[PDB]
Design a protein around this ligand. Structure first.
Ligand code: F4X
Ligand code: MG
Ligand code: MG
Ligand code: NA
Length: 1021
């Protein structure tokens, strides 16, 4: 009759933001309904919390009206068997859509398309007869994207929205003895989708755990854990509020126990009945228990000391009815005099935004991937994670509790694609839907100590609903600051100025929502709050240029307390090719249109969690140990707030142009915020030529729960003495001969022979024996394969004239062909010298001039001098150097300069100067969107096979031309070219990365001088 699909779907509850659930139970902290209290303290499994994960029957429909009525009674024969949890896009049933701002549906709230992909999950399962005669049996859906109706045994149970928070329903009256059948109809789109416009893949399905929980009729319905402290934290009080449902009776009592290991630290017991709260009395169904704790071990990210609270509901005669439990971190979060304090000390947030993404399972996470992310974060000096932009899987907070990470729990509210952004969040008709997303988050995660900051959501402007919900959290949970960046990052709905992509020194004064410089932002009249960037340093491919500038500002300004880098993972997806070889897909690679292509990849680690090179630049800048050194005394400073360096030694080394001369390892016993001065022993000071470099590293001898033994926590380098080569070079035993063609200038000397084309003006090729050496003439280069930062949002459709790639193209940097002006040759006693002079023009105007002279002496060496002019009105070049295609292909590359990893001018602080030797594999960075990559800076010795270059240059080297990288869109479509492409540059523009839609390379890294000069020397070996 009434459990019909006809009647249920007729309500169209998914096109009505006033109905966000039906018959859904109240929210609460994680429950397990342990019937034994030692089971609760131990955090065992519980015989009352069954998992329904596993094999379900699934069938896909284009619209819920297409679902046959029989599906409520029987299984559909057309249905496949599917593992749950699952995003059905990852099973291939329809495409995942990657859109950023633009809604994947027609913006017509509260309505959704008639084409509403419907996933009809079903599951036949058994229930013990004990669950049917006593108690309450409920089903828990931890995550259903994006809304669903629930049937059990053909009868309709309820409805749910908000896809990142659990939905629980009472099944007691619906369950049969023996076999039962669930039928959950998941809708891809709902009115809740208008609040779920996060910049991510748009997936759907039952993508989190499903569970049965059995509880007694008399039950713990909710419990809150609070910890107040005294002046110096030597004494804490743990307040525990416990609420019950069921038959209230005079013999019912509640005990709350606090443990740490096998030690019961405290406990108290009381009957129900709270304090009088107003004229009608108090809450008879509640009670508050206060437990004193002398010298409590405090919870930090540095030391995640956890107690365990056990909540026993029992009778006076001692019959245990039910037990719940939670981990407890003794920690106080407050903002005082403008600073965010944790346990009275000012935090410095080494944060990152982290989406729930897995390249194969989509948005279906587990435990191994979560622990892998957490280990990788702490191993790269990260103390905080923002759950951008929704409540995470419950296990995530438990893990940050234990491994020690500060967490910003963010409500599942983003209306980015609305025009304006506060069209829904300022509408009071949407306040209920938004309140449910906020209140149910707090009701779920309020006992997790790792949660230090509540967030109202992301990119939804500033509306009155934000103010109402901000004030609701402050009233319900004073334990935590509330932050929200929408509407200009400093509205009345945030305790923290939390801008996204605000720059350090540069004002971006957009109307109504200016992104002021973070330094200036603090200074604004009447402004007193701390500033923690909700998002900063857009790590889209080759990026994080200018990252050190942020952390200089963080350390110099007290109220600049850090921020969360955007972001942790590439949201790459996995496709399969001709032969089933996997490759990384991004926007549009599933036929999804419209889409925002590579903007789904902003991580410091690839989707497989392999690191990008920018990761160690973050690790270096966010390291907890700062170093100064005067002469021989290293000043090392702890930026830890709670721990001594009781598992850290400093290894030190001093090396002249690579070769080590002195080792050493002295222990470190620096106090939190303290200092320690280490006198270095008599370091050797040789009269030898070259630069002497000191390198100190902080090494953890013992294994942590997040590192292995020997892990490096921090490092720093200084150039000590440098003695300049004063020696007159070793005399020659031969004079090279010059040969003047009508077309060529050719020089010869033993094995070596060089050939300059007098019509081109370039070194066309050189010889060693009967073995050719070049496949392309050694020519200039003023361009690079554009990085995602140079492209920005520029597409073939809508072009971004302000983007760097478009300023270059419009001036003809890529179409510029050389036009030779002078190319001589002269016989000198010591050598032969050809001087060239090329000009680059496009549509008339001469952009660049490059006067060179090459000097091949008895030397066996070839001295190239380059003196480049660049017009004062052409856009600054991305590069000023040379490139050529080597015939040689060698297995290893050795160089003297900053390494070992990729590094660029505005991203080289993590690199160290040394002699580095890697396979050619690692001199190319496999950015999924190919670009310029693998560059090493500060280099003046490069050894590849028989060749050797020296000067003071920057170089990248691999199998890929930079017009192949430019004309290719996916890494898996690149093929090794014949030979080896090498770009040698005396200068190279920075990569930028404060954001990836505006030019973000600061003036000091723009090739803007006008005249330029570098010197290379080519030689065999
Ligand atoms: C300023 C700029 C670069 C621009 C930039 C808009 C812009 C940039 C970024 C953005 O969202 C950002 O995208 C990131 C992707 O990794 C992250 O999600 C980040 O959290 C988020 O803030 C949202 C909008 N548009 C693209 C506009 C598309 C519609 C978006 C909303 C702006 C509007 O229409 O008012 C044009 C178009 C022509 C010239 C210049 C521009
Ligand atoms: Mg609805
Ligand atoms: Mg957005
Ligand atoms: Na993005």
């Amino acid at each position: 009759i009434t459990d019909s699909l006809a009647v249920v779907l007729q309500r169209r509850d998914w096109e009505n933001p006033g109905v966000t659930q039906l018959n859904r139970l109240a929210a609460h902290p994680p429950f397990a309904s342990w019937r034994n209290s030692e089971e609760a303290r131990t955090d065992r499994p519980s015989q009352q919390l069954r998992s329904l994960n596993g094999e379900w029957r699934f069938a896909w429909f284009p619209a819920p009206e297409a679902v046959p009525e029989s599906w409520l009674e029987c299984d559909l024969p057309e249905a496949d068997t599917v593992v749950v949890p699952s995003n059905w896009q990852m099973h291939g049933y329809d495409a995942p859509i990657y859109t950023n701002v633009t809604y994947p549906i027609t913006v017509n709230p509260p309505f959704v398309p008639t084409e509403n992909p419907t996933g009809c999950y079903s599951l036949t399962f058994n229930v013990d007869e004990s669950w049917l005669q006593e108690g309450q049996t409920r089903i828990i859906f931890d995550g259903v994207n994006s809304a669903f109706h629930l049937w059990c045994n053909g009868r309709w149970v309820g409805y749910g929205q908000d896809s990142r928070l659990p939905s629980e329903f009472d099944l007691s009256a619906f369950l049969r003895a023996g076999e039962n059948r669930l039928a959950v109809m998941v809708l891809r789109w709902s009115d809740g989708s208008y609040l779920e416009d996060q910049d991510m893949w748009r997936m759907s399905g039952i993508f989190r755990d499903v569970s049965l929980l059995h509880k007694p009729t008399t039950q713990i319905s909710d419990f809150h854990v609070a910890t107040r402290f005294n002046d110096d934290f030597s004494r804490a009080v743990l307040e525990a509020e416990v609420q019950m449902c069921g038959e209230l009776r005079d013999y019912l009592r509640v005990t709350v126990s606090l443990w740490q290991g096998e030690t019961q630290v405290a406990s108290g017991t009381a009957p129900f009945g709270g304090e009088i709260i107003d004229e009608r009395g108090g809450y008879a169904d509640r009670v508050t228990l206060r437990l004193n704790v002398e010298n409590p071990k405090l919870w930090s990210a540095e030391i995640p000391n956890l107690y365990r609270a056990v909540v026993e509901l029992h009778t006076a005669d001692g019959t245990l009815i039910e037990a719940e439990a939670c981990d407890v971190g003794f920690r106080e979060v407050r903002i005082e005099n403008g600073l965010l304090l944790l346990n009275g000390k000012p935090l410095l947030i080494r944060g990152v935004n982290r989406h729930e993404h897995h390249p194969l399972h989509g948005q279906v996470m587990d435990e191994q991937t979560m622990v892998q992310d957490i280990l990788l974060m702490k191993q790269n000096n990260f103390n905080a994670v923002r759950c951008s932009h929704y409540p995470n899987h419950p296990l995530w907070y438990t893990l940050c509790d234990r491994y020690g990470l500060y967490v910003v729990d963010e409500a599942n509210i983003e209306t980015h694609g609305m025009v304006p952004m506060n069209r829904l969040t300022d509408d009071p008709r949407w306040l209920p839907a938004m309140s449910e997303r906020v209140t149910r988050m707090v009701q779920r995660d309020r006992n997790h100590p790792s949660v230090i900051i509540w967030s109202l959501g992301n990119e939804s402007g500033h509306g009155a609903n934000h103010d109402a919900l901000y004030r609701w959290i402050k009233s319900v949970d004073p334990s935590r600051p509330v932050q929200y960046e929408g509407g200009g990052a400093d509205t009345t709905a945030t305790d923290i100025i939390c801008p996204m992509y605000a720059r350090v020194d540069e004002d971006q004064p957009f109307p109504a929502v200016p992104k002021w410089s973070i330094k200036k932002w603090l200074s604004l009249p009447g402004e007193t709050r701390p500033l923690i960037l909700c998002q900063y340093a857009h790590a889209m491919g080759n990026s994080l240029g200018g990252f050190a500038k942020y952390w200089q500002a963080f350390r110099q300004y007290p109220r600049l307390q850090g921020g969360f880098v955007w972001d942790w993972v590439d949201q790459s997806l996995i496709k399969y090719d001709e032969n089933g070889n996997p490759w990384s897909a991004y926007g549009g690679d599933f036929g999804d249109t419209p889409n925002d292509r590579q903007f789904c990849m902003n991580g410091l680690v690839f989707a497989d969690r392999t690191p990008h090179p920018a990761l160690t630049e973050a690790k270096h800048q966010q390291q907890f140990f700062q170093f100064r050194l005067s002469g021989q005394t290293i000043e090392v400073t702890s930026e830890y707030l709670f721990r001594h360096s009781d598992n850290e030694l400093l290894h030190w080394m001093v090396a002249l142009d690579g070769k080590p001369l002195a080792s050493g390892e002295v222990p470190l016993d620096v106090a939190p915020q303290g200092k320690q001065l280490i006198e270095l022993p008599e370091l050797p000071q040789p009269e030898s030529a070259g630069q002497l470099w000191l390198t100190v590293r902080v090494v953890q001898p013992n294994a942590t729960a997040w590192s292995e033994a020997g892990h490096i926590s921090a490092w720093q380098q200084w150039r000590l003495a440098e003695n300049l080569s004063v020696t007159l070079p070793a005399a020659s035993h031969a004079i090279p001969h010059l040969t003047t063609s009508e077309m060529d200038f050719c020089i010869e000397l033993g094995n070596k022979r060089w050939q300059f084309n007098r019509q081109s003006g370039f070194l066309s090729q050189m010889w060693i024996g009967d073995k050719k050496q070049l496949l392309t003439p050694l020519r200039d280069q003023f361009t690079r394969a554009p990085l995602d930062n140079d492209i920005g949002v520029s597409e073939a459709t809508r072009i971004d004239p302000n983007a760097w790639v478009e300023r270059w193209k419009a001036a003809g940097h890529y179409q510029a062909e050389a036009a030779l002006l002078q190319c001589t040759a002269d016989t000198l006693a010591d050598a032969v010298l050809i001087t060239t002079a090329h000009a680059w023009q496009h549509q008339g105007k001469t952009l660049f001039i490059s006067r060179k002279t090459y000097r091949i002496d008895g030397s066996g060496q070839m001295a190239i001098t380059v003196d480049v002019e660049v017009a004062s009105d052409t856009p600054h070049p991305a590069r000023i150097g040379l490139n050529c295609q080597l015939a040689q292909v060698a297995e290893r590359v050795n160089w003297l300069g900053l390494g070992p990893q990729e590094n660029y001018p505005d991203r080289l602080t993590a690199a160290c100067f040394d002699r580095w030797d890697l396979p050619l594999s690692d001199m190319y960075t496999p950015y999924v969107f190919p670009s310029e990559n693998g560059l090493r800076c500060g280099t003046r010795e490069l050894n590849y096979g028989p060749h050797q270059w020296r000067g003071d240059f920057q170089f990248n080297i691999s199998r890929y031309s930079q017009q192949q990288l430019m004309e290719t869109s996916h890494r898996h479509l690149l093929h090794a070219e014949e030979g080896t492409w090498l770009n040698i540059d005396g200068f190279h523009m920075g990569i930028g990365g404060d954001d990836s839609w505006s030019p973000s390379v600061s003036a000091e890294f723009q090739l803007s001088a006008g005249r330029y000069h570098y010197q290379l020397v080519w030689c065999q070996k």
